């Protein structure tokens, strides 16, 4: 009903919120589509349950929580249920309900 | 206060909502930063007040409202207050309060 929800629900950019144990706490429709799995299904999965192999800059997982900095990797491969998804990924810190989490934005490249 | 607002406010992706006359009706902090102008300042401007010259696929402006399709152009130049910003841009339809508008997502390339 809100405009921010409407934006999240219609944007092309895939968005996930991960907690610092890498559990998925939020996904938008673009993320559902990207991972070919319902939101009911992807939420509360560990990221490693969703992605079986990753080629990435490890700083994406660490630096946002520590430096406060967004980190972008323009050459990520996530292997998902058999197939490589080639992605640009940005990870940013997001404090949600006084808890520091990771905001993950992804686009196919 | 809401999680969707928090996501919009912390994401790296610049987001604008334009009405079908190309007036800016919403911008997130990433968009404010990209255009080097406050939200109080960019909202209700015409897009052509913000950008003085554009190199783009015109379909970005038309097809979302007509076909319902998202359109992506990976080689956009927007000339803003003198300097070219080189961007990948996606435009998608978004029905807000029964009104069809354009959701514009942008990232520096």
Short mmCIF file of C-alpha atoms in Angstrom, two decimals:
data_model
loop_
_atom_site.label_atom_id
_atom_site.label_comp_id
_atom_site.label_asym_id
_atom_site.label_seq_id
_atom_site.Cartn_x
_atom_site.Cartn_y
_atom_site.Cartn_z
CA UNK A 1 0.00 0.00 0.00
CA UNK A 2 2.87 2.42 0.66
CA UNK A 3 4.86 4.10 -2.16
CA UNK A 4 8.19 2.64 -0.89
CA UNK A 5 6.62 -0.88 -0.92
CA UNK A 6 5.27 -0.21 -4.42
CA UNK A 7 8.74 0.85 -5.56
CA UNK A 8 10.35 -2.29 -4.05
CA UNK A 9 7.69 -4.48 -5.65
CA UNK A 10 8.12 -3.01 -9.15
CA UNK A 11 11.82 -2.31 -9.44
CA UNK A 12 14.06 -4.42 -11.69
CA UNK A 13 16.90 -4.43 -9.16
CA UNK A 14 16.91 -7.60 -7.00
CA UNK A 15 17.12 -6.70 -3.28
CA UNK A 16 17.74 -8.96 -0.27
CA UNK A 17 18.29 -8.08 3.39
CA UNK A 18 20.69 -10.53 5.13
CA UNK A 19 21.38 -10.62 8.80
CA UNK A 20 25.02 -10.94 9.89
CA UNK A 21 24.74 -14.73 9.93
CA UNK A 22 23.77 -14.44 6.23
CA UNK A 23 20.11 -15.48 6.80
CA UNK A 24 17.69 -13.84 4.30
CA UNK A 25 15.29 -11.58 6.16
CA UNK A 26 13.69 -9.77 3.17
CA UNK A 27 13.48 -10.24 -0.64
CA UNK A 28 11.66 -8.19 -3.23
CA UNK A 29 9.85 -9.63 -6.32
CA UNK A 30 12.90 -8.99 -8.50
CA UNK A 31 14.99 -11.18 -6.11
CA UNK A 32 12.28 -13.90 -6.10
CA UNK A 33 12.43 -13.89 -9.92
CA UNK A 34 16.22 -13.88 -10.01
CA UNK A 35 16.47 -16.89 -7.70
CA UNK A 36 13.34 -18.53 -9.33
CA UNK A 37 11.82 -19.08 -5.88
CA UNK A 38 8.85 -17.59 -3.98
CA UNK A 39 9.45 -15.01 -1.18
CA UNK A 40 7.68 -17.38 1.22
CA UNK A 41 10.41 -19.85 0.17
CA UNK A 42 13.56 -17.66 0.09
CA UNK A 43 13.02 -15.79 3.35
CA UNK A 44 14.75 -17.34 6.39
CA UNK A 45 17.00 -19.46 4.14
CA UNK A 46 20.71 -19.12 4.67
CA UNK A 47 22.34 -17.44 1.64
CA UNK A 48 24.38 -20.62 1.13
CA UNK A 49 21.14 -22.65 0.80
CA UNK A 50 20.13 -20.37 -2.07
CA UNK A 51 23.56 -20.12 -3.79
CA UNK A 52 25.76 -23.23 -4.12
CA UNK A 53 28.98 -21.54 -5.28
CA UNK A 54 30.01 -17.93 -5.52
CA UNK A 55 32.79 -16.08 -7.19
CA UNK A 56 32.94 -12.70 -5.44
CA UNK A 57 34.94 -10.16 -3.50
CA UNK A 58 34.74 -11.32 0.13
CA UNK A 59 34.76 -7.63 1.19
CA UNK A 60 31.03 -7.63 0.11
CA UNK A 61 30.29 -9.71 3.20
CA UNK A 62 32.53 -7.94 5.72
CA UNK A 63 33.34 -4.36 4.91
CA UNK A 64 29.78 -2.94 4.97
CA UNK A 65 29.32 -4.13 8.63
CA UNK A 66 32.71 -2.79 9.66
CA UNK A 67 33.60 0.25 7.59
CA UNK A 68 30.02 1.44 7.00
CA UNK A 69 30.97 1.52 3.33
CA UNK A 70 28.96 0.24 0.38
CA UNK A 71 31.00 -2.28 -1.61
CA UNK A 72 30.36 -3.04 -5.28
CA UNK A 73 31.67 -6.03 -7.24
CA UNK A 74 30.85 -5.81 -10.97
CA UNK A 75 31.94 -9.37 -11.70
CA UNK A 76 30.10 -11.76 -9.44
CA UNK A 77 29.05 -15.26 -10.29
CA UNK A 78 26.41 -16.91 -8.13
CA UNK A 79 25.73 -20.58 -9.02
CA UNK A 80 22.04 -21.11 -8.28
CA UNK A 81 20.30 -24.50 -8.60
CA UNK A 82 22.86 -25.50 -11.24
CA UNK A 83 23.32 -22.32 -13.34
CA UNK A 84 25.76 -19.40 -13.04
CA UNK A 85 24.06 -15.98 -12.66
CA UNK A 86 26.50 -13.23 -13.72
CA UNK A 87 25.77 -10.15 -11.58
CA UNK A 88 26.98 -6.79 -10.43
CA UNK A 89 26.41 -6.79 -6.64
CA UNK A 90 26.44 -3.98 -4.10
CA UNK A 91 26.27 -4.54 -0.38
CA UNK A 92 25.49 -1.71 2.01
CA UNK A 93 24.90 -1.52 5.77
CA UNK A 94 21.31 -1.01 6.95
CA UNK A 95 20.27 -0.62 10.58
CA UNK A 96 16.93 -2.21 10.96
CA UNK A 97 15.19 -2.08 14.31
CA UNK A 98 18.52 -1.24 15.97
CA UNK A 99 20.14 -4.32 14.29
CA UNK A 100 22.93 -3.98 11.68
CA UNK A 101 22.14 -5.96 8.54
CA UNK A 102 23.31 -6.13 4.94
CA UNK A 103 21.35 -4.61 2.13
CA UNK A 104 22.24 -6.57 -1.07
CA UNK A 105 21.39 -5.03 -4.51
CA UNK A 106 21.91 -7.17 -7.61
CA UNK A 107 21.56 -6.73 -11.39
CA UNK A 108 22.35 -9.13 -14.22
CA UNK A 109 25.35 -7.94 -16.29
CA UNK B 1 10.36 4.19 9.90
CA UNK B 2 9.23 1.37 7.59
CA UNK B 3 11.63 -1.28 6.22
CA UNK B 4 10.81 -0.38 2.57
CA UNK B 5 11.60 3.32 3.33
CA UNK B 6 14.83 2.22 5.05
CA UNK B 7 15.77 0.18 1.99
CA UNK B 8 15.06 3.11 -0.37
CA UNK B 9 17.05 5.46 1.86
CA UNK B 10 20.14 3.21 2.02
CA UNK B 11 20.35 1.63 -1.40
CA UNK B 12 23.07 2.64 -3.88
CA UNK B 13 20.67 2.54 -6.83
CA UNK B 14 19.29 6.02 -7.69
CA UNK B 15 15.47 5.93 -7.97
CA UNK B 16 13.07 8.58 -9.29
CA UNK B 17 9.32 8.42 -9.91
CA UNK B 18 8.24 10.57 -12.90
CA UNK B 19 4.71 11.30 -13.86
CA UNK B 20 3.80 11.01 -17.56
CA UNK B 21 4.62 14.67 -18.11
CA UNK B 22 8.14 13.82 -16.83
CA UNK B 23 7.73 15.77 -13.53
CA UNK B 24 9.73 14.22 -10.64
CA UNK B 25 7.35 13.03 -7.95
CA UNK B 26 9.81 11.02 -5.78
CA UNK B 27 13.62 10.69 -5.39
CA UNK B 28 15.64 8.60 -2.99
CA UNK B 29 18.93 9.71 -1.31
CA UNK B 30 20.98 7.93 -3.98
CA UNK B 31 19.20 10.05 -6.66
CA UNK B 32 19.75 13.25 -4.62
CA UNK B 33 23.47 12.37 -4.48
CA UNK B 34 23.64 11.49 -8.16
CA UNK B 35 22.08 14.78 -9.22
CA UNK B 36 23.97 16.70 -6.42
CA UNK B 37 20.70 18.32 -5.31
CA UNK B 38 18.45 18.00 -2.24
CA UNK B 39 15.14 16.02 -2.47
CA UNK B 40 13.31 19.19 -1.44
CA UNK B 41 14.96 20.69 -4.55
CA UNK B 42 14.61 17.87 -7.14
CA UNK B 43 11.00 16.93 -6.45
CA UNK B 44 8.43 18.66 -8.69
CA UNK B 45 11.15 19.67 -11.17
CA UNK B 46 10.65 18.62 -14.76
CA UNK B 47 13.25 16.00 -15.75
CA UNK B 48 14.53 18.43 -18.39
CA UNK B 49 15.23 21.03 -15.66
CA UNK B 50 17.49 18.47 -13.96
CA UNK B 51 19.18 17.08 -17.12
CA UNK B 52 20.26 19.46 -19.91
CA UNK B 53 21.08 16.87 -22.59
CA UNK B 54 20.51 13.16 -22.80
CA UNK B 55 21.78 10.41 -24.97
CA UNK B 56 19.30 7.54 -24.52
CA UNK B 57 16.88 5.10 -26.06
CA UNK B 58 13.61 7.03 -26.38
CA UNK B 59 11.74 3.76 -25.68
CA UNK B 60 12.70 4.37 -21.97
CA UNK B 61 10.15 7.19 -21.93
CA UNK B 62 7.34 5.54 -23.91
CA UNK B 63 7.33 1.78 -23.86
CA UNK B 64 6.87 1.26 -20.09
CA UNK B 65 3.57 3.29 -20.17
CA UNK B 66 2.35 1.46 -23.25
CA UNK B 67 3.68 -2.06 -23.31
CA UNK B 68 3.90 -2.51 -19.52
CA UNK B 69 7.48 -3.60 -20.15
CA UNK B 70 10.60 -2.57 -18.26
CA UNK B 71 13.16 -1.08 -20.64
CA UNK B 72 16.88 -1.00 -19.92
CA UNK B 73 19.50 1.11 -21.70
CA UNK B 74 23.07 0.28 -20.57
CA UNK B 75 24.61 3.25 -22.35
CA UNK B 76 22.92 6.43 -21.25
CA UNK B 77 24.52 9.80 -20.92
CA UNK B 78 22.74 12.44 -18.88
CA UNK B 79 24.43 15.89 -18.95
CA UNK B 80 23.74 17.40 -15.52
CA UNK B 81 24.78 20.94 -14.54
CA UNK B 82 27.64 20.73 -17.06
CA UNK B 83 28.97 17.15 -16.66
CA UNK B 84 28.07 13.89 -18.42
CA UNK B 85 26.88 11.12 -16.05
CA UNK B 86 27.33 7.71 -17.75
CA UNK B 87 24.53 5.43 -16.53
CA UNK B 88 22.68 2.21 -17.06
CA UNK B 89 18.97 3.16 -16.79
CA UNK B 90 15.86 1.04 -16.39
CA UNK B 91 12.37 2.41 -16.62
CA UNK B 92 9.37 0.43 -15.43
CA UNK B 93 5.66 1.20 -15.09
CA UNK B 94 4.31 1.79 -11.57
CA UNK B 95 0.66 2.45 -10.74
CA UNK B 96 0.58 4.80 -7.86
CA UNK B 97 -2.75 5.80 -6.39
CA UNK B 98 -4.48 4.60 -9.57
CA UNK B 99 -2.10 6.79 -11.70
CA UNK B 100 0.42 5.26 -14.15
CA UNK B 101 3.91 6.64 -13.57
CA UNK B 102 7.48 5.76 -14.49
CA UNK B 103 9.83 4.15 -12.03
CA UNK B 104 13.41 5.11 -13.09
CA UNK B 105 16.38 3.10 -11.68
CA UNK B 106 19.91 4.34 -12.42
CA UNK B 107 23.47 3.18 -11.70
CA UNK B 108 26.79 4.66 -12.79
CA UNK B 109 28.61 2.40 -15.30
#
